[PDB]
Design a protein around this nucleic acid. Structure first.
Ligand code: K
Ligand code: K
Ligand code: K
Ligand code: K
Ligand code: K
Ligand code: K
Ligand code: K
Ligand code: MG
Ligand code: MG
Ligand code: MG
Ligand code: MG
Ligand code: MG
Ligand code: MG
Ligand code: MG
Ligand code: MG
Ligand code: MG
Ligand code: MG
Ligand code: MG
Ligand code: MG
Ligand code: MG
Ligand code: MG
Ligand code: MG
Ligand code: MG
Ligand code: MG
Ligand code: MG
Ligand code: MG
Ligand code: MG
Ligand code: MG
Ligand code: MG
Ligand code: MG
Ligand code: MG
Ligand code: MG
Ligand code: MG
Ligand code: MG
Ligand code: MG
Ligand code: MG
Ligand code: MG
Ligand code: MG
Ligand code: MG
Ligand code: MG
Ligand code: MG
Ligand code: MG
Ligand code: MG
Ligand code: MG
Ligand code: MG
Ligand code: MG
Ligand code: MG
Ligand code: MG
Ligand code: MG
Ligand code: MG
Ligand code: MG
Ligand code: MG
Ligand code: MG
Ligand code: MG
Ligand code: MG
Ligand code: MG
Ligand code: MG
Ligand code: MG
Ligand code: MG
Ligand code: MG
Ligand code: MG
Ligand code: MG
Ligand code: MG
Ligand code: MG
Lengths: 128, 224, 160, 33
RNA sequence: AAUAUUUAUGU
RNA sequence: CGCGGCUCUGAUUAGUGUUAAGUCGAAAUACGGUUCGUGUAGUGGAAGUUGCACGGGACUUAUCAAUGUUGAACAAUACGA
RNA sequence: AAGGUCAUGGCUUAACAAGCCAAUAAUUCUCUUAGUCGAAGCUGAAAAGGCUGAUCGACCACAUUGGGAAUGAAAAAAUCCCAAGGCAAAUAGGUACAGCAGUGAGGAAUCUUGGUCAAUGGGCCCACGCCUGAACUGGUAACUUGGAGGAAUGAGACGUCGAUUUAUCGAGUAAAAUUCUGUAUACAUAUUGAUAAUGACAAUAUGUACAUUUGUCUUGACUAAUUACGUGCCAGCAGUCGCGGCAAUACGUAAGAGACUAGUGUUAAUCAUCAUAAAUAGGUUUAAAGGGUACUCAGACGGAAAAAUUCGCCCAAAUAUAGGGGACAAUUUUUCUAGAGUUUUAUGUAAGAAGGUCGUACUCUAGAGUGGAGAGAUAAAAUUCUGUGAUACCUAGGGGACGGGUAAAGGCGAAGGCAAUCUUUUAUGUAAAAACUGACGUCGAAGGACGAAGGCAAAGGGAACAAAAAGGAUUAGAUACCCCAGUAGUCUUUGCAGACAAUUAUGAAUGCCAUAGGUUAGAUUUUUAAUUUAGUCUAUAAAUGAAAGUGUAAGCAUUUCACCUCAAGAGUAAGGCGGCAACGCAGGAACUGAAAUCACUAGACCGUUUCUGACACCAGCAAU
RNA sequence: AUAGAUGAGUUUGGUGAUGGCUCUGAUUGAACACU
């Protein structure tokens, strides 16, 4: 592009790239609180197979998104106030959010010994 | 870019650097190739560099942006004009076999065209008439036509004597009991006979084919 | 104008790329000043203005050209002798910097930095063998000849 | 563009050209031609 | 020298 | 109070995205078995298909009925695979 | 012309003149978003870097929202006047915590309803002094930073544990133990913040004294670090690629190892990575991307030799007074001829247009034609034509559009496109010589003009071909490919329409780089054959390119305009503009992905070509 | 301010390109989880 073409404003910004968690990336928020609307199961994509525990959450902003329930076993159901954080289930389309396990109503895995911080589990407290 | 990269003009530079140091550090370098010191003071010559070639004729002084500046020019001499003029008036002068193979290249050392046409080393040819013509046209200030007549007439009188010797020599030899072989005239006719006969065979064979074809061409399928 | 310097820079590259012994250039004051600078740096061998045909090679520098009047000014042309050493041209690259679309000017503070291999402005540091030519009030000088004279100006070309 | 990729766009333009003819009457009533 | 039937499918 | 703009909602309806395991054909890639595409105008459950002009991103993929010659004899001390 | 003003200016007025700014949006309008800036914060190696616009300083605006004025040296108010709604109020006419602390609400998320005016600053005051939720201090929160948080010795307790080769390898100098120090901190003393005097609270120095926690992530590759067991495409892991289907270094436990540490990971965001919007500094033949075309306003760019002015550019800054230097740059002047043009009827030529015609075939009619049962179609047939006399062979008329040979790698126009012929008419372009003008040039957003076939509209024409509609076949079915027929339409005239593989998949233009063989229209010559100008086409050199290839350019450079920034959604939506319509111009976002994509290489395949072997086939015999 | 310029994983039967995505670096008036 010639110099004259750059004066008239030919260098426009590159097209935006969709974020992993638009609901959080839009308002510059690290997490958001929401009430579960449905707790079900999602089917993985072509290569993977199984059942992913997902929850349809209605964020405080108003948008309804599909979060992922990490860990083994959950205690949340309809009308449960759970905290949402960014992330995504790479093998589940539409699931672009996670749920903190040490959240308000969602309880951390009780029989977890590895990476307890990731699943909101207190120390076993055996020798204490 | 298909062709390979030839680094032959740098063999000394490359080879000398490879011999300056040893692969095993800390040791003295081994003796270099035996040719490294032979061409030490004989570097190659500059190649692949187009110069302005020699101009054998004045270049066009009118061209404002001429091309083919790095193109060798044609060699033209004043004799080229005369050679064409002579050999056109005497076309059969080319049938006289002339040798262009050179013996030692020194044939020009004994050519003094001020004496006449007959020189040392070279035969009496149309070239001798041109050089003699050129000499008169330059030294004696003669015109192209005048000098042409003079040198041309001296050429005839010499050619006449050569043709008269052949006849008188043969006739003279036979008066004292001298017999010769087959002359070119008889030898030429015998060859034509052998070739004509071969044509008679071909014509005879082809003539047969054509007449036979006519028989087959005509429809004689049913005989009544 | 500066367009003549760009055409001259590219022509000398094509001529050296073709391994030509001689080359012609339009006869202009601007072209001559850069040619003299290249000669003063050792990149070309000769400079001589003549007709559309090159002078005699044997007596190139001895060739005395005729006066340049208005009757033959249109035919005059500068003839520069190119240089080749060790299977390589001495004038390989002649990348220009100042183009007709933009005339890049440099200051003395920047030329001092560029002359030692450090970028400054729209220029880049000079490496081993590279040479930069600047058009100043004292003629078309070399970046190192302009540093001793303490002057800046228009940057013409960069020779590798 | 290759022939293969052009065929991808040949199928989009045909289905769109086909959709407008189907909806032409409906669009005319709504004053959207 | 200007001939010409029909041949779909394959986690 | 009217006109216009904007936001939300709307029975009903359209398009598109995603989703190994489904149904119907076999359009494309080989001359893909009607050359394939571009434009325009029609048409058919669907892919498709038809007219007209254009493009090669298809035919340079091209390989002899000129049928291929006694082109100056022979012999000598010349000549000697 | 007059007044006013230090002075200047329609600043003001009278009388005349019709100007002034702009033309590519000057000006105005609607929508979305935002307090602005600073090495102030973060970031990069860097760019007049990018992002933010907290704490710091400067500027702007606001004090429930809206509508307003005065006082004053100066509005520079949390003031004042009016209106509305909320709270409060009734005959009242207050209040708005975006002042400090604090409460509720919202949110993933951010503090004490403290002390003092001792210090610093301000207001009032003769003075003393009063007031100050500014400010100074204490409190809360690992939010961040800085520091401390312990050093030396420690060999046979001939003990303990963990593995496992049952005797090897580790926990392990690790622990205990011993010998020292007194760090944060506690206490005590002194000094100090402050002096004319005033100490809310604390700092600093010295002395003595005390040895107090681990936590977290990771361990297939990227990426430092391993086994065993359990689970068995299940449960689950995952930043990217991916792992799990019965002997998993990837999931879940146990142990070991790697690493950070009062922090450690995760999520969100910014810079860099990314030359990944490229001014420095990109690219568009085949991968995203050259506009259908070039005439052309604006605008960018563009010769030679001098001169004037600017003093641009440079010394050279600090937004530098005043100067110096003159190559270059800007406006301007005088000359020059290489660019671009004009004249001298070029030659050659399917650019274009008008008015007319020619011909080969076709088609219709006629002859009371000759002839007298078939013809045509297709791979084969059927529908169909024919006794109202067809096909075939003739004669005489009528009617439409088409353009055989010549013909070529050929030529002509801006492109689209242009091929029978006569006359009339039309702009460029090419060669050679002189002459002439003297930079008058190239590119070119927009506007306008032109723009294939098909199509719309009106009036004509209608032989032939042929979408559609319909019929006959083929086929498992057949809208279709094939066939009998056939309407729009192709043609003329006048408009609309503007989309193309509108192509050289390659914008236009300028300068430049080595050869060869053809070819087109000229020129020169010793016109036989060689030079030469402008085109075009093959094959190469240097070089260039991812390569294919190009090599009169896809090379080296330059000028200018258009266009591109992962795929898909999508050239789609909505509003708008153009059109009678069909449609065209312009042109997103949401949702969803880690890939889409180009060239080449070796194979395989082909209802692909040409060969080579085989009872593979043909033929014959025998058999099922 | 003269040391300051760096890569890695991932498209293909495969090779070489084009081109995005992610990782490696630094940081926040941050939030959450385990401490
Ligand atoms: K995937
Ligand atoms: K097809
Ligand atoms: K084009
Ligand atoms: K000056
Ligand atoms: K003049
Ligand atoms: K290139
Ligand atoms: K849409
Ligand atoms: Mg562990
Ligand atoms: Mg493309
Ligand atoms: Mg299949
Ligand atoms: Mg609805
Ligand atoms: Mg097919
Ligand atoms: Mg086909
Ligand atoms: Mg077609
Ligand atoms: Mg076309
Ligand atoms: Mg093909
Ligand atoms: Mg091909
Ligand atoms: Mg705002
Ligand atoms: Mg602020
Ligand atoms: Mg308030
Ligand atoms: Mg407050
Ligand atoms: Mg709350
Ligand atoms: Mg005070
Ligand atoms: Mg006091
Ligand atoms: Mg005070
Ligand atoms: Mg006082
Ligand atoms: Mg202490
Ligand atoms: Mg490793
Ligand atoms: Mg894990
Ligand atoms: Mg992969
Ligand atoms: Mg594991
Ligand atoms: Mg710390
Ligand atoms: Mg257009
Ligand atoms: Mg186009
Ligand atoms: Mg000056
Ligand atoms: Mg003149
Ligand atoms: Mg001219
Ligand atoms: Mg003519
Ligand atoms: Mg009859
Ligand atoms: Mg009849
Ligand atoms: Mg007619
Ligand atoms: Mg064309
Ligand atoms: Mg013809
Ligand atoms: Mg032409
Ligand atoms: Mg032009
Ligand atoms: Mg235009
Ligand atoms: Mg038309
Ligand atoms: Mg029409
Ligand atoms: Mg009509
Ligand atoms: Mg039909
Ligand atoms: Mg049918
Ligand atoms: Mg028909
Ligand atoms: Mg029009
Ligand atoms: Mg253009
Ligand atoms: Mg040629
Ligand atoms: Mg041509
Ligand atoms: Mg070529
Ligand atoms: Mg797209
Ligand atoms: Mg639209
Ligand atoms: Mg468009
Ligand atoms: Mg192949
Ligand atoms: Mg058999
Ligand atoms: Mg048999
Ligand atoms: Mg492949």
């Amino acid at each position: 592009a010639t110099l004259n073409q750059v004066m008239r404003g030919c260098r426009k910004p590159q097209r935006a790239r969709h974020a992993v968690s638009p609901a959080l990336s839009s308002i510059k928020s690290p997490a958001l609180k929401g009430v579960c609307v449905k707790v079900g199961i999602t089917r993985p994509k072509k290569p993977n197979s199984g059942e992913r525990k997902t929850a349809r959450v209605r964020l405080s902003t108003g948008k309804v998104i599909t979060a992922y329930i990490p860990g083994e076993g959950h205690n949340i159901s309809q009308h449960s106030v759970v905290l949402v954080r960014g992330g995504r289930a790479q093998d589940c389309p539409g699931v672009r959010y996670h749920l903190v396990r040490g959240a308000l109503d969602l309880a951390g895995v009780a029989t977890r010994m590895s990476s307890r911080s990731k699943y909101g589990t207190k120390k076993p407290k055996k020798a204490s | 870019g298909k062709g390979r990269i030839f680094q032959a003009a740098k063999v000394y530079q490359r080879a000398s650097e490879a011999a300056a140091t040893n692969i095993v550090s800390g040791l003295p370098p081994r003796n270099p190739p035996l040719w490294l010191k032979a061409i030490e003071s004989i570097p190659p010559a500059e190649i692949n560099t187009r110069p302005y070639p020699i101009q054998h004729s004045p270049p066009n002084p009118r061209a404002r942006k001429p091309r083919n500046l790095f193109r060798p020019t044609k060699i033209v001499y004043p004799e080229d004009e005369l050679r064409r003029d002579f050999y056109r008036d005497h076309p059969w002068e080319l049938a006289r076999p002339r040798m262009i193979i050179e013996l030692d290249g020194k044939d020009a050392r004994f050519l003094d065209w001020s004496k006449g046409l007959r020189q040392r080393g070279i035969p009496l040819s149309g070239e001798s008439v041109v050089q003699r013509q050129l000499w008169l046209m330059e030294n004696q200030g003669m015109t192209k036509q005048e000098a042409y007549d003079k040198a041309r007439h001296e050429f005839y009188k010499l050619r006449q004597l050569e043709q008269m010797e052949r006849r008188i020599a043969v006739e003279e030899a036979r008066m004292v009991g001298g017999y010769f072989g087959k002359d070119l005239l008889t030898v030429g006719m015998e060859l034509e006979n052998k070739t004509y006969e071969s044509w008679k065979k071909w014509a005879t064979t082809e003539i047969a084919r054509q007449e036979s074809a006519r028989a087959s061409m005509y429809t004689n399928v049913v005989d009544n | 104008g500066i367009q003549q310097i760009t055409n001259m820079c590219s022509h000398l590259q094509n001529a050296s790329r073709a391994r030509l012994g001689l080359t012609s250039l339009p006869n202009t004051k601007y072209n001559l000043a850069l040619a003299l600078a290249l000669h003063r740096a050792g990149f070309i061998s000769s400079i001589t203005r003549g007709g559309p045909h090159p002078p005699t090679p044997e007596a190139l520098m001895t060739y005395e050209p005729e006066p340049v009047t208005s009757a033959n000014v249109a035919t005059r042309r500068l003839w520069v002798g190119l240089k080749y050493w060790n299977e390589e041209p001495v004038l390989k690259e002649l990348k220009p910097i100042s183009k007709p679309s933009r005339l890049v000017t440099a200051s003395l503070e920047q030329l001092n930095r560029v002359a030692r291999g450090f970028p400054a402005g729209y220029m880049k540091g000079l490496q081993l063998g590279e040479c930069l030519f600047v058009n100043t009030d004292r003629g078309v000088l070399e970046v190192r000849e302009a540093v001793e004279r303490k002057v800046g100006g228009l940057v013409l070309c960069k020779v590798k | 563009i290759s022939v293969r990729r052009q065929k991808k766009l040949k199928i989009k333009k045909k289905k769109y050209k086909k959709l407008m003819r189907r909806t032409r009457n409906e669009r005319r009533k709504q004053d959207r031609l």
